[PDB]
């Protein structure tokens, strides 16, 4: 994150402030989601599954969010990606 210098006799001492993750949990992951016949890939994050539902969260922190159209992009069909799962993709335009 950042470092603070400190003076020392014939030297220098750095106070390196680092980000160390902790309290990790296991989750089921999938490379892509197939809802409208085409595959979906996260722009920033990774798919996670708590056993019953699927969510999208960042890599360095657990923040489960609904799989919306704004968080993923469409590229190719579903019969190419190995390990793709079937899950619905929320579209913000339909309810509005």
């Amino acid at each position: 994150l950042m470092s603070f210098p400190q003076s020392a006799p014939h030297g220098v001492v750095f106070l390196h402030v680092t980000y160390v993750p902790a309290q990790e949990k296991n989750f089921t992951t999938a490379p892509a989601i197939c809802h409208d016949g085409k595959a979906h890939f996260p722009r920033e994050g990774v798919f996670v599954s708590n056993g019953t539902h699927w969510f999208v969260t960042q890599r360095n922190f657990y923040e489960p969010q609904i799989i919306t159209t704004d968080n993923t992009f469409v590229s190719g069909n579903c019969d190419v990606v190995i390990g793709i799962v079937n899950n619905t993709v929320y579209d913000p335009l339909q309810p509005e």
């Binding site: 160390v20 993750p21 490379p31 892509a32 890939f41 890599r59 190995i82």
Partner: protein
């Protein structure tokens, strides 16, 4: 005549174990084993993270994983064949000795 060579502290077995541990951490945790706890992650997702880091979308890997694995295997085989055939590959260590 007094010239005596001392053996190193870490033997070849310990260096091999360290190398195997580094390799296992790299293939099972990506870059998280060095920054903190070893977070397990599939290799076809570590490769996707690497591609996203080099500026390539992850769909390229998710569509050409087979070709990329074949190219990696062929490259490893060619490296092994070059190390087996070319004797001057490790010339620096031999020159030091």
């Amino acid at each position: 005549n007094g010239l005596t060579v001392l053996p190193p502290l870490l033997t070849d077995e310990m260096i091999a174990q360290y190398t195997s541990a580094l390799l296992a951490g790299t293939i099972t945790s990506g870059w998280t084993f060095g920054a903190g706890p070893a977070l397990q992650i599939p290799f076809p997702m570590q490769m996707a993270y690497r591609f996203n880091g080099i500026g390539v979308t992850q769909n390229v890997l998710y569509e050409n994983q087979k070709l990329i694995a074949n190219q990696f295997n062929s490259a490893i085989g060619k490296i092994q064949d070059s190390l087996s055939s070319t004797p001057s590959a490790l010339g620096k260590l031999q020159d030091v000795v």
